[PDB]
Design a protein around this ligand. Structure first.
Ligand code: CL
Ligand code: CL
Lengths: 163, 11
């Protein structure tokens, strides 16, 4: 069964709302498990309290750097890891996909698309989709800018698994 | 451009 995970988002500490994601463990099990475990914190580390350091309106929200807090850091539950496959494409808003530094450099950083990002197909591993709370993602998006810097700090105040 | 990288953010 494909797991469901949630982020509770805050804006400069003010609770905003919840975003939930279906993780496509049937197609990309290793990539899904990494995100799931980092979301629960069950390995002893993960996304809770980290920020979306880069948000570009009309494009995506990028987060998952819980080691350096600025996009330069990140670590998977495996100690980087391989691009599992490119079966799923960046088809529209709500797509959940891995940030990277080129081939086989998956860590913990990810992005939530707010539009179709077809130009990233074959280069970033898609592993989930927003299930509920796309309205919250759209609210987050408004705090971004062209260069990615956010006008208020957008944080994962809490995160975990629903199903 | 519009990229999602970890390390050098590019065009
Ligand atoms: Cl709303
Ligand atoms: Cl709002």
């Amino acid at each position: 069964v494909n797991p469901t995970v949630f982020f509770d988002i805050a804006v400069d500490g003010e609770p905003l709302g919840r975003v939930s994601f279906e993780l496509f463990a049937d197609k990309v099990p290793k990539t899904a498990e990494n995100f799931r475990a980092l979301s629960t914190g069950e390995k002893g580390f993960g996304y809770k309290g980290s920020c979306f350091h880069r948000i570009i309106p009309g494009f995506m929200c990028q987060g998952g750097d819980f080691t350096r807090h600025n996009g330069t850091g990140g670590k998977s539950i495996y100690g980087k890891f391989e691009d599992e496959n490119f079966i799923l494409k960046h088809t529209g808003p709500g797509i959940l996909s891995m940030a990277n530094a080129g081939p086989n450099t998956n860590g913990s950083q990810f992005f939530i698309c707010t539009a179709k990002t077809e130009w990233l197909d074959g280069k970033h591993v898609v592993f989930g989709k927003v299930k509920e709370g796309m309205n919250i993602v759209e609210a987050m998006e408004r705090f971004g800018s062209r260069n990615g810097k956010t006008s208020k700090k957008i944080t994962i105040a809490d995160c975990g698994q629903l199903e | 451009x519009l990229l999602v990288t970890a390390x050098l953010v590019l065009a």
